[PDB]
Amino acid sequence: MNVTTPEVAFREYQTNCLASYISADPDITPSNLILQGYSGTGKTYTLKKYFNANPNLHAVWLEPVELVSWKPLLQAIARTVQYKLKTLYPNIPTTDYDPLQVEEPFLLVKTLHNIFVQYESLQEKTCLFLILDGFDSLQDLDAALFNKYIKLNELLPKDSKINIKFIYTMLETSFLQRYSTHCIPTVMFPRYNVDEVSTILVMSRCGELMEDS
């Protein structure tokens, strides 16, 4: 690959095992990727540091804690994928589809298919990284919603130029031990150390204390 591993200070395994799973070629990239951790364990920081260290590949940042049930989640996916593609390849005729038309998972499949088959005018096949930061932080959550996002690349077309690659972010480890037989690449984030907390706080806070008037 040609990705740039970031210099995250105390997640050294995770950035190496994150550049081994996020690439610009859609063949050498998994279709689902879990980043299970706990509160404060550095998931979003190392994700943003990785995606800022690699400006070429395309991210979709979506947080299902401010989108309570599953229907605003589908509507927000179908909204922001189209909004990301509008500002990525501007010179393609992009007929705006309404994200509120999505009411079911099937209509998300149909809407995303009609969005993707209008970008065939490109040159080479790319992947778009849709990040669901906090999938267990969904408020009105059930045990069978995650099966509807695993088996979504089974429905998007195979010889297409834009392929959706998900990156989840879990937090609970009894949620993830239900989807264990699906064999999704799981990158676990263990809880920080006192010797590491004591200097994470120093590198984070001692800039805004001398600059505190």
Q: According to the annotation, is 37 in a ligand binding site?
A: yes
To ligand AGS, the closest distance from the beta carbon of 5 in angstroms equals 14
Q: Which stretch binds ligand AGS (CB under 6 A): 3-11, 15-23, 94-102, 205-213?
A: 3-11
Residues shown for the chain: 213
CB under 5 to 8 A by kind: which of other proteins, ligand AGS, Mg ion, none does 54 bind? none
Strand order in the sheet with 58-62: 58-62, 126-133, 162-169
| Residue 89 binding ligand AGS, by CB under 6 A | no
Q: According to the annotation, is 207 in a ligand binding site?
A: no
C-alpha atoms less than 13 angstroms from C-alpha of 34 in its C-beta half-sphere: 23
Q: Which stretch binds ligand AGS (CB under 6 A): 52-60, 108-116, 117-125, 197-205?
A: 197-205
Q: According to the annotation, is 126 in a ligand binding site?
A: no
Q: What is the dihedral of CA 68, 40, 9, 18, to 10 degrees?
A: -40
Q: If you ran DSSP here, which 8-state letter would residue 179 be given?
A: S
CB under 5 to 8 A by kind: which of ligand AGS, other proteins, Mg ion, none does 8 bind? ligand AGS
Q: According to the annotation, is 15 in a ligand binding site?
A: no
Residue nearest to Mg ion (CB): 44
How far, in Å, CA of 50 to CA of 48, rounded?
5
Q: Which of residues 2, 7, 27, 39 is near ligand AGS by CB under 6 A?
A: 39
How far, in Å, CA of 86 to CA of 83, rounded?
5
Q: 78, 88, 29: which is closest to 56 by C-alpha?
A: 88
Q: According to the annotation, is 43 in a ligand binding site?
A: yes
Q: Which residues bind ligand AGS (CB under 6 A)?
A: 8-11, 37, 39-45, 171, 200, 203-204
